[PDB]
Amino acid sequence: FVGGTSFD
């Protein structure tokens, strides 16, 4: 997901 450390 956009907005975090290495998330989808």
Tell the residue number behind the tokens 């907005």, with chain if given: 3
7 with 1: CB under 8 angstroms? yes
This structure was determined by NMR
Rounded Cα–Cα distance for residues 1 and 8 (Å): 4
Rounded Cα–Cα distance for residues 2 and 6 (Å): 9
The full DSSP string for the chain is --SSSS--
Neighbouring C-alpha atoms within 13 Å toward the C-beta of 8: 0
1-8 burial, b for 16+ CB within 10 Å, e for fewer?
eeeeeeee
Q: What does R_g of the chain's alpha carbons equal in angstroms?
A: 4
